[PDB]
Design an enzyme around this catalytic site. Structure first.
Site, PDB file in Angstrom:
ATOM      1  N   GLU A  14      -2.035  -9.211   1.550  1.00  0.00           N
ATOM      2  CA  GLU A  14      -2.353  -9.691   2.889  1.00  0.00           C
ATOM      3  C   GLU A  14      -3.772 -10.248   2.944  1.00  0.00           C
ATOM      4  O   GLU A  14      -4.010 -11.316   3.509  1.00  0.00           O
ATOM      5  CB  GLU A  14      -2.196  -8.561   3.910  1.00  0.00           C
ATOM      6  CG  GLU A  14      -1.048  -8.775   4.882  1.00  0.00           C
ATOM      7  CD  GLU A  14       0.293  -8.890   4.185  1.00  0.00           C
ATOM      8  OE1 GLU A  14       0.352  -8.635   2.964  1.00  0.00           O
ATOM      9  OE2 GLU A  14       1.286  -9.233   4.861  1.00  0.00           O
TER      10      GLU A  14
ATOM     11  N   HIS B 178      -2.769  -5.125  -1.955  1.00  0.00           N
ATOM     12  CA  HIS B 178      -2.663  -5.694  -0.616  1.00  0.00           C
ATOM     13  C   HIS B 178      -2.830  -7.210  -0.655  1.00  0.00           C
ATOM     14  O   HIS B 178      -3.938  -7.739  -0.564  1.00  0.00           O
ATOM     15  CB  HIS B 178      -3.712  -5.075   0.308  1.00  0.00           C
ATOM     16  CG  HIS B 178      -3.234  -4.884   1.714  1.00  0.00           C
ATOM     17  ND1 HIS B 178      -2.362  -3.881   2.082  1.00  0.00           N
ATOM     18  CD2 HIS B 178      -3.513  -5.573   2.846  1.00  0.00           C
ATOM     19  CE1 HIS B 178      -2.123  -3.962   3.380  1.00  0.00           C
ATOM     20  NE2 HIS B 178      -2.810  -4.981   3.867  1.00  0.00           N
TER      21      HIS B 178
ATOM     22  N   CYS C 242       0.827  -1.201   0.000  1.00  0.00           N
ATOM     23  CA  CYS C 242       0.000   0.000   0.000  1.00  0.00           C
ATOM     24  C   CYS C 242       0.865   1.257   0.000  1.00  0.00           C
ATOM     25  O   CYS C 242       1.122   1.846  -1.050  1.00  0.00           O
ATOM     26  CB  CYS C 242      -0.928   0.005   1.216  1.00  0.00           C
ATOM     27  SG  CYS C 242      -2.624  -0.508   0.853  1.00  0.00           S
TER      28      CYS C 242
END
Length: 188
Positions: A165, A163, A76
């Site tokens: 994640e 992202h 990010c």
């Protein structure tokens, strides 16, 4: 051991949570702490720069620029932190959320392992590097997000806009699982 430093982003839990499920030891550290905290562990294998609102509000960003000695994967705002550090620029393009980000035949065959050439991946075009610094090269470019991933040749540095994640991140957990694993390796 891997170290995860936050720069304002509250989406760091996904970094430590994922690594755990992958079998990689790592610890999260706040920004309020002194840089010496992360600079005192030069033995580390890899580092993860959690997302955030702006990396220009924290002073720790300077430590990450000098701590390039080790492989740091920014997310990010991470990729944006390396830019301003090298002398680049970043801005906003599409604040939209629901969008597609397909990537053609492009990969460093390092963290993008277990991934094909042409595949559709999720990624928000909120903010991305607008300048083209010297010494950096894109490992993965999308039809809409060419700056999906940027790695420096001068030093072991990595950056990404999307992202990985999050679980919804298509083909994203691969780069986060492959990297966290490459440096996740520890000794007993």
């Amino acid at each position: 051991m891997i170290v995860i430093l936050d720069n304002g982003g509250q989406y760091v839990h996904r970094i430590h949570r994922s690594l755990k499920y992958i079998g990689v030891s790592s610890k999260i550290v706040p920004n309020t702490t002194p840089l010496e905290e992360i600079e005192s562990n030069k033995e580390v294998k890899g580092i993860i720069l959690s997302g955030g609102p702006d990396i220009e509000k924290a002073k720790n960003c300077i430590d990450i620029a000098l701590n390039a000695k080790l492989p740091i994967l920014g997310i990010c705002l991470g990729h944006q932190l390396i830019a301003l550090a090298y002398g680049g620029e970043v801005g906003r393009a599409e604040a939209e959320e629901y969008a597609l980000t397909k990537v053609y035949v492009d990969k460093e065959n390092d963290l993008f392992k277990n991934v094909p050439r042409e595949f559709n991946a999720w990624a928000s075009h909120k903010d991305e590097v607008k300048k083209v610094p010297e010494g950096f090269e894109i490992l993965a470019h999308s039809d809409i997000c060419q700056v999906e991933a940027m790695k420096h040749k001068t030093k072991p540095i990595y950056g990404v806009q999307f992202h990985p994640e999050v679980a919804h991140t298509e083909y994203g957990n691969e780069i986060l699982k492959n990297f966290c694993k490459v440096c996740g390796y520890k000794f007993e």
